[PDB]
Design a protein around this nucleic acid. Structure first.
Ligand SMILES: O=C1NC(=O)[C@@]2(CCN(Cc3ccccc3)C2)N1
Ligand SMILES: [Mg+2]
Ligand code: NA
Ligand code: NA
Lengths: 806, 240, 334, 49
RNA sequence: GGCCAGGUAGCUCAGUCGGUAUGAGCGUCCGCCUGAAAAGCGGAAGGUCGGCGGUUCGAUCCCGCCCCUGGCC
């Protein structure tokens, strides 16, 4: 999780150390955080309450001392003697909740079972509840981006505010703010395997704490406002320092540690019982903390119950470690443990504050629990020991942020901002050498430095300068064609939909396809939203037919839908390629290898029709959808593509075998059209007579014809010819044969009669075409047009076996 | 006054029309359009875009992966790999727009959809700055939200951009509305495509079409945009 | 910034008419000789107030076009006279409609920039030149084939050409009966966008057809595109998941009542529950009465948040029936 | 293969289509399209030129 | 990962811990009616009650698992 919660009082406190009297409106602070790159999710205040809300002491009803000896009476949490907060009769708790009532952290709008129990000495019985609880405070819920793991604490966010407001900042992790505890010897024997990714491991024990002691109210309150429930002073300080400095801390029971501590990779099948009392199956790529007996903690995730601080621990060994971010993120996501420590370790933690944050816990623990800080310390800092945790320096021009932003910043802006975020900046002519601080591993390239200068100066100063328009070529031929196809279909009565690539469950089984059908060879999705729809679409019809059913099932029974989208047609099993190094450009052989591993994804156009094709009106009763309407959709797409198509009968499911046409462009098959099979319509719940079209736009070649027609000024000759052919002879084949024979005099040919009957014969039909002959340079005689007609008749007899009607 | 429309006109989809209008806006500014496969390799969808190895978006939680496991093949979480293919195939300078189908793990409700269309821009040339990005975003906003449209950028983070920013739009037809993201092309992305970061800079941006169409027209239920109901498309007219 | 809204609309109108069966021509600005005398226009007709060219190629054609119809009809005659009898032509061009006599402006010194007032003076001295769209139809509107003998051109085809231009312009138009030459007075509609007149459509006057040598039943349409405001609608449909109710209402009105006026009265009375209304019957049988006609409309009621009962839809139908009785004098059939 | 196009498709004029192709060519390079009156004053047709 | 609460006709939803869901509203069909319609009146069609199994002479209703939704986390 990228969530970070802290109250305004704690954030203002750290900022006010360097800038005394600094205080801004929470609305203004939200605009400042949102302006420097921190997304604010919510700005929730506390409470509020008024009137009878005070703190009392208990003496399961019991007398509650509301103050000044005015005892009033009113679940398993508190006992006798614990200071509690009560909304005295006539309550006004958020929002409008009106004997007495012992309030809780949730009823008062302050935290998360039982009632609220203030620690002994937090407030005299009778003090103002709103003043003790600090209800005037405001909690900020921030969503920290993964590149700013240093902002997972008050230290980082207070530093960001000091940068935005140009303030003097006092690092709460410095040795002037955290006095270095003495180092008089080792704290505990420690062994570490250097191949596990640990950068630093620090240990310091605390001796003789009071088990019955509890954390003060200011410490417990800041934990609840940050989303962490208080437990005991030993654990409360470990979570409090994590929220303050960003270095997560974990407390162990010093007396419950047997032998030498050891950071080591886990083993297969090894299970460690964490602090929550749950068995966790571990992997060989996990980091652990073990001793001579069991496992003490999981590296950077959560401690184990073997060394868990109980409610009676007196000797505590505090841990300050720096784990590998990749190993922590890989481990916490496997067993689902988004703990506060794992979320910060995966975003990297400042390795230079390990001892500083360690000494922060010891002094804070011994103060509130009455312990004695041991002057021993074991600080393993790698092999060889690392004493400088600074990242490599970065070089960039002094005006690079000015060029990237397009703003002429005042001189010294880049150097001031980079030093403001904690980087060492040296000058060498016009080149800056920038060494980022140890808490900024994200700064690695000049672009990272540019972001820091631009976000701190504010992106509002960047002007709006439209770049010069390059000499573009515009829409390609295929892009223009898809528009024309969409326009032509929409103007013909079709409604476009957005098809879904996930096929319905067993759609091809409903279509009755064979087992070896190429459309069944789909691409499966590993994690689909519906477990019964993992296969990707090899055809746009199921998505269209699904939308057709949706419209019909809702009262729209006369539908004509179309869609233009790609399909997913794999040619082999799902095969991936190896990782190509990102530090260079992949060669053309590796690029072609990447394309070959991907399934064929051609762009298809498809359409479905059902109900009335033409609606009824004052002209007539309308016309139901028939297969010819699907064939006309082919012609509409063809005219939009400026190509000639031919239709031939074909048997291709889910289309009706006697009402299906295969569309060809020249000699290449581009798709099918016609009416769907009645069995497919019945099993799929489709309306009767449903027709469908689907074409492959990639198979249709882009054409750019340049016609040069010559309008003849001479009169035309009109003639009609009737030809008798077999029933299975397509009318287009007769028209093509007549055209091929008539010659250049034939200006136009149109079919206008299809006649069957006993005068013609069984399984035969008569076709009458209207012919228009015209010469380009003369007036024709009737014999001249009849000669071209007789040649067309002879050409029809030789190609389709036509007989002149007698 | 008798009805004479014997063939009632249909309708192109509003998302397609919005995509066409967005395309014409950038064509008029010298840009071009590019297409890419929806089933994309992990090399072009994550690796070439400076996504870390253990990035949470590379898991089975947010990205539709292709079976079997560890196949490095997935449905694209953005049209950015289309720009990577353009940066590898075309010569510099490059001013291209990618409008294609995008796939995310979010469920389909009144304000989210797993299958949405987004527009992503990519400009790489000598001397491109954030001011050139903001000027392009403003021209994009004015063409889609009116002459009084203005954009605002707030610093953010994206793996393939540095510095990164989110874009908010202001339109006087409803305040600021979250529109999309932008930023300068990360030098790692330029090195992953054989381009010198010291000689060529560049910016990028990306907005969702269903998102843009939702708050602009005031469409309440976004499920009506993808379910293909005729009652949703017809009021938008026939089309261009 | 690319194409303007007007330039973009001119493309869409041309595409829609071409895909609907019309053939684009380039109209000549020079009017034919005495074409307005063939149309029978009055002496004070605004279309006669033309701009004349001093040195035309043909001395009998000096006047510039105030309307696009004469050039379309001349191109219509050429096609028909050469064996192309079933033709639908359209054109998109400007006209020249002066508001005064030919008045010139003196020579402005070109050594400087003309002031904004001098630029406005040069524009006021020029005749008004708005963009017009027009079309003409003759012969068969739908050709013959294996479906049947085809359908000859009628006035409804010209009315449909208006709705094609309207849908391409994304504007709502209304058609009203009008007497405007050269159209047939009983088959002529005046097109309105809201309350502004933008043109006319229908069948041409039979006398104008005889005097002009036009085919019988010739229809025409002309619209002023400048009088049509460029619209940019932003619809926000709310698809209701609840079922609809289907009912039909048969109303008897006088023959002169337009069918759209009855539909507008039914919608005004039905309310928001009415999702769709469509006329599908115009009956003029003897049981209806002389000069009276019966109109039957298909109604589709749907609620956005509930499932209606038959009484709920009937209550909206009855309210629609009363609205028609009050606005167009409709009587419920029975 | 029977004829099914009951509405005979028309055609935009080639000159109009060429002008549209020419316009898109320059608009793709950043240019814009302007219009003017065919009946023009002699000041703008000759004197200003 | 927790008990729960939900998936039921074309659409929107009620209802039963075992033999009939005499399911509702709207949608579909027939008759009277109309030139043809609708309404009205009078008749009907249509669900394998979330899937695979378990018990039972018999399961929408009880055991188990899962598919998908909210809830509260
Ligand atoms: O949720 C989301 N939908 C989207 O399109 C994004 C918004 C834009 N982002 C892509 C991008 C980020 C930076 C530069 C260029 C493109 C993704 N996020
Ligand atoms: Mg950065
Ligand atoms: Na047929
Ligand atoms: Na034969």
């Amino acid at each position: 999780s990228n969530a970070m919660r802290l109250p305004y009082s704690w954030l203002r406190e750290v900022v006010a150390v360097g800038a005394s009297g600094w205080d801004v409106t929470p609305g203004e602070l939200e605009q400042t955080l949102l302006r420097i790159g921190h997304e604010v999710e919510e700005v929730i205040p506390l409470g509020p309450v008024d009137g009878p809300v005070t703190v009392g002491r208990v003496a399961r009803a019991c007398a509650v001392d509301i103050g000044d000896r005015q005892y009033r009476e009113i679940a398993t949490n508190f006992a006798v003697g614990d200071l509690v907060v009560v909304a005295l009769p006539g309550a006004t708790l958020p929002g409008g909740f009106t004997d007495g009532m012992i309030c809780s952290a949730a009823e008062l709008n302050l935290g998360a079972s039982g009632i609220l129990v203030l620690p002994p000495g937090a407030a005299e019985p009778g003090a103002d509840g709103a003043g003790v609880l600090g209800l005037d405070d405001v909690v900020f819920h921030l969503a920290i981006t993964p590149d700013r793991g240093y902002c997972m604490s008050v230290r980082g966010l207070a530093r960001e505010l000091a940068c935005a407001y140009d303030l003097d900042f006092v690092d709460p992790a410095s040795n002037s703010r955290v006095p270095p505890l003495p180092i008089e010897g080792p704290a505990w024997p420690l062994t570490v395997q250097p191949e596990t990714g640990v950068r630093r491991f620090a240990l310091r024990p605390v001796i003789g704490i009071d088990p019955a002691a509890v954390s003060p109210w200011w410490l417990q309150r800041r934990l609840l406002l940050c989303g962490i429930r208080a437990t005991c002073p030993a654990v409360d300080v470990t979570n409090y320092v994590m929220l303050e400095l960003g270095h997560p801390m974990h407390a162990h029971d010093r007396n419950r540690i047997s032998g030498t501590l050891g950071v080591r990779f886990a083993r297969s099948g090894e299970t460690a019982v964490t602090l929550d009392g749950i068995e966790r199956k571990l992997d060989t790529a996990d980091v652990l903390i073990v001793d001579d007996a069991a496992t003490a903690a999981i590296g950077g995730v959560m401690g184990a119950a073997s060394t868990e601080v109980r409610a009676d621990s007196t000797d505590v060994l505090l841990e300050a470690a720096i784990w590998d971010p990749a190993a922590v993120s890989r481990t916490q996501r496997r067993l689902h443990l988004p703990s506060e420590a794992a979320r910060r370790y995966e975003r990297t933690v400042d390795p230079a504050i390990s001892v500083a944050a360690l000494d922060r816990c010891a002094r804070l623990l011994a103060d509130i629990a009455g312990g004695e800080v041991s002057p021993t310390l074991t600080d393993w800092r790698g092999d060889p020991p690392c004493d400088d945790w600074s990242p490599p320096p970065i070089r960039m021009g002094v005006d690079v942020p000015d060029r990237i932003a397009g703003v002429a910043y005042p001189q010294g802006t880049t150097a001031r901002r980079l030093a403001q975020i904690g980087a060492v900046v040296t000058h060498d002519g016009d080149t800056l050498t920038v060494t980022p601080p140890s808490w900024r591993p994200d700064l690695r390239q000049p672009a990272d430095l540019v972001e820091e200068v631009l976000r701190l100066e504010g992106l509002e100063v960047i002007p709006s300068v439209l770049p010069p328009a390059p000499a573009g070529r515009g829409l390609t031929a295929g892009q223009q064609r898809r528009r024309t196809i969409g326009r032509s279909l929409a103007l013909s009565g079709y409604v476009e939909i957005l098809p879904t690539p996930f096929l319905p469950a067993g759609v091809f089984d409903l279509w009755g396809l064979e087992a070896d059908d190429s459309r069944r060879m789909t691409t499966r999705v590993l994690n689909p939203l519906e477990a019964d729809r993992p296969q990707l679409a090899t055809t746009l019809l199921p998505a269209l037919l699904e939308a057709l059913v949706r419209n019909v099932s809702r009262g729209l029974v006369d539908v004509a839908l179309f869609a233009i989208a790609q399909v997913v047609q794999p040619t082999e099993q799902t095969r991936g390629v190896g990782l190509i190094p990102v530090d260079r450009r992949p060669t053309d052989d590796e690029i072609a290898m990447l394309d070959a591993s991907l399934p064929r994804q051609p762009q298809h156009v498809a359409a479905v029709l059902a109900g009335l094709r033409e609606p009824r009106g004052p002209w007539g009763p309308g016309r139901p959808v028939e297969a010819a309407d699907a064939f006309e959709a082919v012609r509409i797409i063809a005219r939009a593509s400026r190509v000639d198509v031919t239709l031939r009968p074909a048997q291709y499911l889910p289309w009706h075998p006697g009402r299906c046409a295969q569309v060809f462009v020249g000699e290449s098959s581009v798709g099918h059209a016609g009416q769907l099979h009645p069995a497919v319509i019945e099993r799929s719940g489709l309306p009767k007579g449903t027709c469908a079209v689907e074409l492959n736009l990639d198979a249709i070649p882009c054409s750019a014809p340049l016609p040069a027609p010559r309008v003849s000024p001479y009169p035309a000759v009109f003639q009609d010819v009737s030809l008798v052919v077999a029933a299975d002879i397509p009318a287009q084949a007769v028209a093509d044969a007549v055209r091929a024979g008539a010659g250049d005099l034939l200006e136009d040919i149109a079919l206008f009669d299809v006649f069957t009957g006993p005068q013609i014969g069984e399984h035969r039909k008569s076709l009458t075409f209207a012919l228009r002959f015209r010469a380009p340079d003369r007036t024709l005689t009737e014999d001249d047009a009849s000669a071209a007609r007789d040649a067309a008749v002879q050409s029809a007899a030789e190609r389709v076996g036509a007989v002149l009607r007698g | 006054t008798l009805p004479s429309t014997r063939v009632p006109a249909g309708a192109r989809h509003p998302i397609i029309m919005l995509a066409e209008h967005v395309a014409d806006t950038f064509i008029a500014m010298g840009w071009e359009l590019a297409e890419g496969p929806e089933v994309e390799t992990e090399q072009f969808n994550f690796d070439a875009l400076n996504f870390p190895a253990d990035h949470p978006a590379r898991g089975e939680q947010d990205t539709f992966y292709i079976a079997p496991e560890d196949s490095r093949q997935l449905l694209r979480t953005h049209t950015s790999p289309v720009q990577i293919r353009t940066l590898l195939a075309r010569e510099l300078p490059v001013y291209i727009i990618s409008i294609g189908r995008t796939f995310r793990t979010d469920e389909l409700d009144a304000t989210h959809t797993p299958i949405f269309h987004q527009v992503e821009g990519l400009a790489v040339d000598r001397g491109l700055s954030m001011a050139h990005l903001r000027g392009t975003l403003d021209a994009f906003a004015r063409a889609e939200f009116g002459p009084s449209a203005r954009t605002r950028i707030r610093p953010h983070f994206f793996p393939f951009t540095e510095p990164s920013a989110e874009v908010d739009v202001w339109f006087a037809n409803k305040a600021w509305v979250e529109w999309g993201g932008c930023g300068m092309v990360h030098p790692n992305v330029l090195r992953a495509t054989g381009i010198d970061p010291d000689l060529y800079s560049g910016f990028a941006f990306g907005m969702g079409l269903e998102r843009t169409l939702q708050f602009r027209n005031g469409i309440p239920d976004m499920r009506d945009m993808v379910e293909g109901d005729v009652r949703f498309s017809l009021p938008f007219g026939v089309g261009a």
